[model samples]
Target: PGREILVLHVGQGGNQIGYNFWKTICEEHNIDIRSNQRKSVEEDKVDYKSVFLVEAPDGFHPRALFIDLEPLAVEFLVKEMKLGSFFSEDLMVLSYSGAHNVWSIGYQTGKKLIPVILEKIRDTMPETLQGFLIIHTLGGGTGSGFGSLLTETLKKEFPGKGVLNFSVLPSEVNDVTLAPYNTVLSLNHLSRFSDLVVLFDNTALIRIVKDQLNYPVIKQFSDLNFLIGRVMASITASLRFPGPLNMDLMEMAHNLVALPETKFIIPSVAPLTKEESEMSTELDLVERCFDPTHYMVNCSGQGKTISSVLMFRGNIAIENAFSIMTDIKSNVAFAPGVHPDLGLKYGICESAPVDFDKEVTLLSNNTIISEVFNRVLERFDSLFNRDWYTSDYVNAGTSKSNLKEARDNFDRIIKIYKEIEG
Candidate 1:
């Protein structure tokens, strides 16, 4: 009866952050952490079926699948995170070897797991089947290589459904020597197969935590997952809660991806604080979401916005929301002759995620994002031209010709963004 999503949490990056995501959403749905029980669903509920599989006498379970190319990755999640009891173990899979930060290895290995992956996916089909939301990193071997295979498979098999990707970009401190290579190849598949792409980078993520929440309190990568979860949670909040102008996956894809090639939507969450900065007024939250500092990715401030999707949670009045949106129309730039309403879409959900009085996530698709790819291309070319790590890829699973094509793909995407700017 309602739009529902199945999540493909691919690779170690996918499973780790994906855990926090389930934790965040489950807490919002008031499901106990270790218990995983929806004990109070009847009292004051949002539709849990959007992310969860069912409501049995035992508890609610996630329709999420986890696939890691290397062993030991899911071990930490299952054992330490207590994820073994969190969701269905039948939906998770692991491989004996890892991609070693190589795109081809990940993709090649992922091919062997396709039948198993598809079987679990088929079994978990929801009533309405809105689409698949894949969480992974572009720079990592598995997230890039295997991530692409899964995206390609879904596009081919379930051609009717939409696919949204939460693609984490490489950190400023490279995760590996071939980070850009993986990003280059994986992005090609992501752009081609996905309906919408929401990007996150650790550079901006690190900066946000330091500036807003202070860095001394943060110790590791899992801490960054906290922010990632909040952003992902806000994007889906409207779909689960009772709200005006509620949008489904396709509805959002339709609004945000007006130009299909320009589907990389950058996200920023407003009022990010240490112990929940809850005092800001509704209008203040609207204004902060537009600020670049709140953005999770560092985009070169070039080009105009193609489209933006804004979701506001917690006690926001529809009248007040309309008032600020009208003011923001002229403040933010848009593609030429693009009507403001067409370029800007918004929805409101009364229930905010716990620990915050209100939360606003801004998903911006702008010509400026081309610079992020351009930056990566520059780094990719520097080493690629020297043939420094070329043999590793060729021996692993990709060819020099494949690398060339991926390079051309990034070039084409950058040019397309430039064309749209004018």
Candidate 2:
């Protein structure tokens, strides 16, 4: 038996990006859909169960569950992408028009659907199921509300399994006016239950596509999703493929999170695409991972690092990584009080042959994350203080006390970050 994962993509943004994520995996693994009879399993063949396999095909399936309140996005995926075979048809649940960006509505609807979802998950999982890989944005109605509720439920139902979240933050040009409220409430739940939460900002992703990667201006969320998928692939490469120094999800969580409150691990990856692999050496890739331009979120290097896991793939030597990391420790600026040798960890793995060019992803418990919560707190307070949208939340069953409690939790997180900020 192999370590298996259940991928849960929640709401419109989650499902849309989930499609792109599977596409990226298929390309990286050279997975192809065959019209002929499926090949018999061979002991020597790649373990499809590790990353991509269902009962049906040789292509990517993600052992995934796709959920959304609206049918439009799922319809597009089925009709256009022909991804209907990639996951269980019954597991795809589309209830009504949509959650309409209301937190309580999405949460309540998700609660109603939990029993069916869990049953399907139990039937689909391998005996050696490792944990869950969840993808969703924290600023939307269904993604934030239902996603949080589901994460919380998974914890209660499967106390033995771990849960990791790819939490997408809203872009600076967000159209959702109530995103601040959604973000605060969702984060409260996410921080409470999720074993690890990896943050990705749409604003950073969009900027990287247009300015750094030199891609055409992104006109829609799918464009952003495509770029985000590449980074996600890099992080999960070792888990998907058999390799030396494979860092499983639990090991990664152990290394990246020091304090229970420091479960928010920020990711920064260099060279999103092969075309950008112009670095002079593996050391160059190592250094580039630390640069702010490669960060998935904005950081000015003012925060102290509580812990970090530097994962490298492609043509890089393990010894070289240790040497480079030592050099980095000496030269690079860290948060004010970090010890030189105590908090850093490194993992090197074989990259896909197509990606012989080295790439690095640095996952760190950095205090600069405080800035993100600071912005959310400011926006949340501005709206809540005025009681601008208080009626909507109250009508949806969330009382004023719930909002204050969420705010208090945000404040608590902010204080922890400040404590780490040197």
Candidate 3:
């Protein structure tokens, strides 16, 4: 757990969240944070072992292709477009832009965003050589579409270095038109390039956040940030403060709650479902044939943090699924993935082609799930309560559309960061 991991805040949607909550938490917890997009592009800022990029894009931005700090601007964009179905608009923009055959405008929007993003990242990292942790949410257009493109670029550019991608996906099946298109594209991309991709469902996080935070829903950027931050902090706390594997998972519950990150972390990973196996062609054939121990993955490197989680649907072994947690040994965390649907089945089961001992244990446990349910119910009520959300939470309207708008605004800010030329 040296400073090998480099923690980077990518994707505009959650940068403010990163700044507002994660920043304070990191300083308080003595964790490292790095943002090369700012004016002070200190070499020491990112001189860590690996870089963890949290890609949280709400909607697509024509600008994110150029800068790192664009999310800040995107945050404002969401606030501006907080009319009818803001979150839906954000999603629509990305989907329409990238989803094809939808609205011509949507396709155009998507067409413009990807190239700019590629140009910025390519320009930024051309001479800079280092591995990265790519984290993004696969539910939204910017996060789902742009995030996938971003990961693929890294893989194509740096083949030898490790690229671990984590995503928070959508659980419910999209039997409709373009909705399914983006999800499939994103999943296919992850299965191909991500070294170790963990999937989670957004459908779950939205509901769980409402229940846990007592909010009407996980609609606004602040609410979303709180949810994301809690997850990152929880996983970080567990690693920083190891829990006793011995006691009833509930007996150890108090310690979990003691940490701030725990409050939001549960929803991110709790309800997960693995999607279909990733496209075989997308994966690196050579790497798949190689072994983990053979390659000296600088996992011990520092300056990393929890990024984002991808929701999925499939069978991801609890041990193997949770093993994704062990790969992360950093102060700043990037993203995480949870598949509520599969319930513990892996669609793409790849463990370095090397065989290791497998231990399976089954013990009856009860109270934890029930307790979690009760807590979720209480939080859901509180999240929607106007008194609880504050003016910061409300920009234009309180509809689900407004939530999407905030997400779109986040994407624009990512472009701003890309422009920093760091």
Candidate 4:
């Protein structure tokens, strides 16, 4: 719990999600909403600082960095939101113009910022730094290119430091024409460097908003980002609160990722609100968390689940929890291709702070994630084969040969996934 975690929020999407996350954290931890600072006196009810708070010279700051190539969002956070005083002086990185949704520019620019980023990280980090947790979307230039570059440098600069990426994969229907190319290139870099990737896609999120919530449509990006922030807050709840079975970042990495190459995790949470939990039984929460419809990405859990860990924040006894887990383990379908002896790995935690009757979050590594990358590759091949926007990449210093290499790497990854699926 004493280990320090450095958080990097990249690009417009990442910064947007980070803003929501901090808002949730402030509410849950009883920090002053307007000031974005801790109350003058400790509430003495719960020690929130151990899990979510960082001590600084002036006051406690969220251990986060807001990195973007554009000035508008960064400026808004400082001036309009009045969160500038909440961050350390060097944590916000806003550059001139923008990356224009080009991967090479973000990557090349990110390289120049790494030194300052590392300096700030080292200055604020605890004696025992745990790792880095990055929030970024895969479709945009800054999030995709710069985010991937930072992950690679984190691994290279600090070997064996756990690196987790909460990546927002683009929807197939998005307005960004170059999203496929950005994703494929970033995925290639991330696959080699990042320890684990928790993937969310807009395709699944938008549908959940319109169809499940019965909202006419997600009117703004903030609406979708709030949903993402909710999932992240749920996962971090166990870590933030005192719990019998707390899973720290490294512990989570060990439980979810059996193989290094297959480290992409898909998460689903049930009882998004206390109102939703009022009528829900433990079994109902379990069923929904395992349901593909609840997943943050378009993934089918059927016959492709490699491993899984379940965490509960509310009132659920360990005995009853195991009963539900055991039942699902027997009934649920896992990849037959996996070794017969290697079955689902499950973990349960009961946090002290949650008041709801039931709340569940599931983290899983499943072969069905291949379906996501496969679609991206299909789109990339269609565009790259015909040389659309080939000049843009070349102008940005991304060689045509690197593009081909990235394609081949993805092909190999897809093949590995198919083997897992079979």
Candidate 5:
């Protein structure tokens, strides 16, 4: 009962990311996919219970909740992927009908139904809870509206606990015509209530896969979201394993969110090899982390880094902190008056990932995030100006003032980022 965290996979996007993440973490932690049992001697070797594992007479169930307004994602996981036994019923919540890409619909419906869901939540409460991690996409109705509502509600219920989000930013060409609007509104709630947000996007994932991996054709969820899951495993590796710099969830939130409304952190993983795992190293992998090409998103680190943590996962060598720190400090751009060394953190996990022998992931907070927000705002501005598909949101009980406020919230965060850059 040292520390605990609950993960909420809210909506189709969040569920897919959480599924891939659970799959990867199980592989690294040596937990069985079918039985949720420890397959080998490595079970007790690491602390998997803090984030995953719920004690039961049958098996070690994961500490996760799969929440979706529709049953498609739930059905696919249970029937097709055969993960029904992986999670319990209390942890899974679904509805017969979908939100039809209307943000207000999910928000309003989730509000009315959350009381019933919260009753089920009481049954699954662990002995401890350090924070709540809500994973979702920012464009879809369920992911955006419902996920934001969950964050606000959880923050109100449990004060002083971290409310973090593994938010998948919507794509340029989205599955929704109202993606821009949903994204804008969700962005406001995220900036207001969530303590930290780890951002990823579809366009950037596709770019990395097609260009970096040189893969001929990009597949659907499997290829685009693969890097984010890998990063998720590495970033949390410090908590589960012994490390040089053990970064707790609270510490990470405090370190990276240097200024107000600057919590959008970008992650980049290095040495994405196609052939084999051994084609990697510490120095090069660390260097590639700072490179824009390796970024999980499309941003080029335009604004200076406020703070960052570089986590390397492997059972290899670890030495010369000054040398490595200096190398990074010289390359990374920091704030006007802040020292790069003061803002930088380093951690090395003894347990390497299943696919990569040595992988370095850099989680950095930069004003360059403003560029991504600006991109979404551009789309919103164009559509909101023309009143494209405005009636759907209006008919769904969302007021014009509410939509206008969401647009203003983006400007507030973006303006802060712009000012901090100077």
Candidate 6:
């Protein structure tokens, strides 16, 4: 008897990405990838090819659900997870625009929606669930906090064999200011439990779309989705497939793409001068390092530091560049040693519609976000204690105290915002 493998698409964010590429992913894998347009939390009509359910629950005040699952998939496809993290889902959902629902992350009724999600996966997928992998991104609030919880629950119910998780990390500059605080703490928690955790940041590919190429704003996520599809195809191609063919195809994929020699990546905090020649020289050096074939050294940047750079080409060239960068970092030949803990800064590349500075000022003055996180954390604690087994770890649930606490937090936040206006 032959075994049928189930690849679970976990986490959330990126609705359009999820909808558009569902069929493409299924086609690539030579199997079905199940997905539902409407969420399992709200609607029950989840009929996917293989039923690839996305477990990225959101839980804001009115719109309670987790966010940040989109970027995780984005970075995963970029090969950060493959290089740094371990194995997870073959197909993951991604998008750029989504809001964090404190209600979703607290002890709201939505908090109880998590069990329904697990139960759906359990009932819908298979009872003897084995060879399942989970791919997601870490950062922001929802995905990092509750997304991990979903994995644990699946491991418990499925039992037997194991589960896999891959994480795409957020930008270093952003991580320091905003994140789960103790990132390594959470990573360590999932280390032994999950098979792997790959991390990527926002600063990595921002420049490829922003500076080097002015890709349309509408296609930002689509372009990202394309990049991910390439990576996922490379992964599936490398691993032993159900049906096989030419040694050349196998060699090209496994020896070329999967091999360290064929791909070159440079993660650094390269400061730039106002002079263009100096900048060009620095960029050229990076290009020569990553692009052995010179097909492309696709680059993108944001913030002060030339934070992230990626180069892809044929064997030998990629290998040579990687070797050069490695030797430089290891030997400390150029100047300073390769600081493994360097916080990557992508420089200032874009602006947000919302005034971040004003928002921070508002938070400092105990504004909306401040009250939100404060009460959210407290309610989360109570919710976890109440139903650790079934808590969505978000939104209003069975507890009255949690509900009251959230309302109180909201009241304060709204009051402050009104004061700022008046």
Model 3, which residues run further than 4 Å from truth?
1-21, 24-130, 171-177, 215-219, 233-422
What would the per-residue lDDT of candidate 2 be over residues 1-422, giving only the tens digit for each residue? 66677888999888988878877666665554322123343423353435545645543455788898887877776667766666447768677767788777788778888888988898878777888888898888899999999999888888888898888887665568788889999889989999999988877777677767687667667777876676667777787665567777889889877678889877877766676664546677767666767777766553566788777777777678777767777666666667787677766667642454777778878888898788888888999999887777788788999989998998898888888774
- Misplaced by over 4 Å in model 2 are 33-49, 55-60, 300-302, 353-356
Residues 115-220, candidate 5, lDDT per residue (tens digit)? 8667765677664677888989988899998998999988988787778888888775766778999999898998999999999888788878887788888655
The weakest ten consecutive residues by lDDT in model 2 span 34-43
Identify the leading candidate in terms of TM-score: 1
**Cα RMSD to native, each candidate?**
1.9, 2.6, 19.7, 2.3, 2.0, 17.4
| Pairs of residues at least 3 apart in sequence or in different chains that clash in candidate 4 | none
Per-residue error (Å), model 2, residue 340 = 0.6
Q: Please, what are the lDDT tens digits per residue for candidate 1 over residues 161-226?
A: 888899999876676778989999988998889998899998888888888777687765678888
Put down candidate 3 lDDT per residue, 189-295, tens digits, no spaces: 55556554433344544554554345665555665554454434333332222232222112223322222212112222322111212322111211221111111
The lowest-lDDT stretch of 10 consecutive residues in candidate 1 is: 46-55
What lDDT score goes with residue 245 in model 4?
67
| Local distance difference test values of all predictions, in order | 0.81, 0.76, 0.33, 0.77, 0.80, 0.32
TM-score list, all predictions = 0.95, 0.92, 0.38, 0.93, 0.94, 0.40
**Which regions in candidate 4 have their CA more than 4 angstroms from the true location?**
39-43, 78-80, 87-89, 300-303, 337-356
Task: Give model 5 RMSD, 1 decimal.
Answer: 2.0
Model 4 C-alpha lDDT per residue in residues 246-363, reported as the tens digit of each score: 6677787787776678888888878665677778777788788778888889865453777877777767766767667566766666776555445445444454224456678888
Poorest lDDT segment (10 consecutive residues) of candidate 4: 346-355
Off by over 4 Å in 5: 42-44, 274-277, 300-302, 320-322
Q: Could you say which candidate leads in lDDT?
A: 1
Worst 10 residues of 5 by lDDT: 274-283
Our model 4 lands, by Cα RMSD against the true structure, at 2.3
| Candidate 4 local lDDT, residue 125 | 70
